[PDB]
Structures are given as C-alpha cells and as structure tokens.
Amino acid sequence: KLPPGWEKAMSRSSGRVYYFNHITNASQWERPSGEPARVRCSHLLVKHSQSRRPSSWRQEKITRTKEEALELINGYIQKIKSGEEDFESLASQFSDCSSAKARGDLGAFSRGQMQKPFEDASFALRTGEMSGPVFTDSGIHIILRTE
Ligand SMILES: Cc1cccc(C(=O)O)n1
Ligand SMILES: Cc1cccc(C(=O)O)n1
Numbered sequence: 831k832l833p834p835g836w837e838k839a840m841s842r843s844s845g846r847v848y849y850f851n852h853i854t855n856a857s858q859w860e861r862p863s864g865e866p867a868r869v870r871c872s873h874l875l876v877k878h879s880q881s882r883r884p885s886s887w888r889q890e891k892i893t894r895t896k897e898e899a900l901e902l903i904n905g906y907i908q909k910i911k912s913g914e915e916d917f918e919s920l921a922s923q924f925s926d927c928s929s930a931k932a933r934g935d936l937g938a939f940s941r942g943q944m945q946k947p948f949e950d951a952s953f954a955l956r957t958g959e960m961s962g963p964v965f966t967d968s969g970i971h972i973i974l975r976t977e
C-alpha cells in the first residue's frame with residue numbers, strides 16, 4: 831500500500847485521516863510519495879540527562895529530562911514545518927551534536943554504521959524528507975535526509 835513504515839491514522843482533533851511513519855516518527859496529512867547503499871543526512875540532536883554522554887559543546891553538564899528534550903524537539907519540528915526557522919539554522923544553534931558546526935550534516939553513511947534507530951529512520955526517509963523525534967542512546971534527533 832504505502833512506502834516502508836507508513837500507516838494511516840485518524841486525527842483526534844479534526845477527524846481527518848493522516849499518515850504516520852512508525853520508523854521515522856514522521857506525520858503528515860499528505861499521502862506519502864511512491865533502498866540505496868548509502869544516504870546522506872543531517873540531524874539536530876537534543877541530549878538529556880539519560881544520554882550516553884550528557885555533555886555537548888553547548889553545555890558541559892546536560893541536565894534536562896528526556897521529556898524536556900522531547901518538548902524542545904517538538905518545538906523545533908514545529909518551527910521547521912511552519913517555516914519560521916530552517917532546519918540548518920536550528921541545528922547550528924541548538925544541536926547537542928558536534929555536527930552542529932556543519933549545519934548538522936553527517937555526510938553519507940551505510941547501514942551498520944550509525945545507531946540502529948537513527949539508521950532505520952534515515953533509510954526510511956526519502957530524499958528531502960524529515961523525521962519526527964527519533965530516540966537513540968545519544969538523545970532525541972530530528973533527521974533530514976539530503977541525498
Ligand atoms: C506539505 C508536505 C509536508 C510533508 C510531506 C509532504 C509530502 O510528502 O507530500 N508534503
Ligand atoms: C564537544 C563536546 C564537549 C563535551 C562533550 C562532548 C561529548 O561527549 O559529546 N562533546
């Protein structure tokens with residue numbers, strides 16, 4: 831029926847159908863369109879107190895709870911989707927990953943290199959698509975597939 835990971839869902843507010851991807855946590859009203867050896871992705875990471883390393887270039891000691899990290903992520907997604915902010919600007923300003931200095935770009939990678947939930951989301955995105963919140967041991971990510 832639908833591309834990998836996508837399912838139909840029912841909006842509680844409006845009652846209209848939408849589409850949710852249980853691999854990427856993406857959600858959208860539009861029916862999703864239409865696997866490579868490698869993909870290229872950028873990401874925005876928000877770490878929390880249960881991250882494998884609760885430290886980053888932004889903050890020597892990261893103390894926010896995982897729930898607080900998810901709220902931050904949800905807010906960044908909202909601003910990206912509304913166009914108030916662009917992904918690259920938010921990643922450069924707020925990603926707890928050292929890749930923030932590269933607008934969140936991680937370059938290209940294969941399966942078997944990244945943390946599995948991050949890998950699976952990256953490979954389930956199509957070029958140009960953005961994930962919803964993706965949880966790994968590093969924290970919570972927003973992933974943008976660029977190639
Ligand atoms: C406007 C919008 C937002 C998210 C996905 C799509 C699409 O896949 O067509 N379109
Ligand atoms: C750049 C930086 C600073 C402090 C911790 C970390 C990390 O462990 O990810 N990275």
Ligand SMILES: Cc1cccc(C(=O)O)n1
Nearest residue numbers: 895896897898899900901
């Ligand atoms: C990521 C998240 C979101 C909401 C609650 C919690 C928690 O109870 O730890 N965690």
Ligand SMILES: Cc1cccc(C(=O)O)n1
Nearest residue numbers: 928929930931932935936
């Ligand atoms: C994964 C990545 C991308 C760009 C810069 C860095 C770093 O300076 O550590 N790391």
